[PDB]
Scaffold this active site. Sequence first.
Site, short mmCIF file in Angstrom:
data_model
loop_
_atom_site.label_atom_id
_atom_site.label_comp_id
_atom_site.label_asym_id
_atom_site.label_seq_id
_atom_site.Cartn_x
_atom_site.Cartn_y
_atom_site.Cartn_z
CG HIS A 16 -2.41 -0.97 0.96
ND1 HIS A 16 -3.32 -0.67 0.16
CD2 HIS A 16 -2.21 -2.11 1.36
CE1 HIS A 16 -4.00 -1.61 0.13
NE2 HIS A 16 -3.46 -2.54 1.03
CB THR A 17 4.29 1.91 -0.28
OG1 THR A 17 4.62 0.91 -1.22
CG2 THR A 17 4.30 1.75 1.22
N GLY A 99 -6.76 -16.21 -8.85
CA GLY A 99 -7.42 -15.43 -7.88
C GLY A 99 -6.81 -15.39 -6.11
CB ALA A 100 -4.41 -17.48 -4.82
CG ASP A 149 0.31 -6.76 -8.79
OD1 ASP A 149 1.04 -6.42 -7.55
OD2 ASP A 149 -0.71 -7.29 -8.70
CL LIG Z 1 -4.81 -12.85 -7.98
#
Ligand SMILES: [Cl-]
EC number: 2.7.1.6
Length: 346
Positions: A16-17, A99-100, A149
């Site tokens: 969250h940076t 979706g993990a 990501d």
């Molecule tokens: Cl994911």
Amino acid sequence: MIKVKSPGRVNLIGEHTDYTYGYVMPMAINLYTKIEAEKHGEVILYSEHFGEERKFSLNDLRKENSWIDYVKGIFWVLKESDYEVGGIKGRVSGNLPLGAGLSSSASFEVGILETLDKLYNLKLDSLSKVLLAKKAENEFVGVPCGILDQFAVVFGREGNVIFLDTHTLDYEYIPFPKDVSILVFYTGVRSSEYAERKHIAEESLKILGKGSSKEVREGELSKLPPLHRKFFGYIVRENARVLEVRDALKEGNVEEVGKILTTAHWDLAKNYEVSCKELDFFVERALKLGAYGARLTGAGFGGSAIALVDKEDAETIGEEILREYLKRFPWKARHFIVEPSDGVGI
Ligand SMILES: [Cl-]
């Protein structure tokens, strides 16, 4: 016919940076989205996970609200960026769990981009790949993510984590300890609150007159409203933790790295309020079973957590916690042992 292996990712510290242009430290992991494809007049892809084929004409980049939209987003960004590419026909598989919280979207998007890059000889440089994938996710798919990501999936290097300054995009590879494994624990719990946090953080930067959280000290926080102050305080503390982990890793001080990750987890849970009891359960148990440290990874509110553990104890710790976890929660939790790996390629 070519084959592309696009890794997933795990953020070690620096959560969250990135939306306030702070520091992050992700790694590509050895779980992948695999794509085997060849040129074609249209776009035809069979997804092993969904067990179905989805296709679209190159003339059709309309959102269909399905996994095919991730593919359309890449074709859209390439066209928007003045590239001429043709269709592809192929299969999408791999062992990266859907979706993990290990970046299924970036792994897939970057994989499609790499497939097109190779089949059509676009000769894209690594940073361009990151920027295109991020733009596709942000503007086409409609998810307001940072650069974390995409950067990890492209720039990952085996045995290393990536220290990245998201404001300048300056980065450096930091070696990961030899016999220390990253135990990944997926809670079994597959947005809104992310958006809220993002808006509050942006208002805070404007109130402080700064363009990046890196330029903010704890003292200045008193000038922010209570809620803004509570959330931004976490961001400032997190940036400082990333730098501390960087130093500790450079010295191979895994014990210190672990302590920092743990401190970060509870800061996220208590002050940023983005954890949940399932994640907290894993962290606490992992620590009691010997982990150097543990922390949720990714956005929070479900997804996966990580624990830094001795390689020889990784399986046993994962197995013991999973058994305890399944007696407590109803989700289909899973554990994986991952290692820092190379970015997208063959
Ligand atoms: Cl994911």
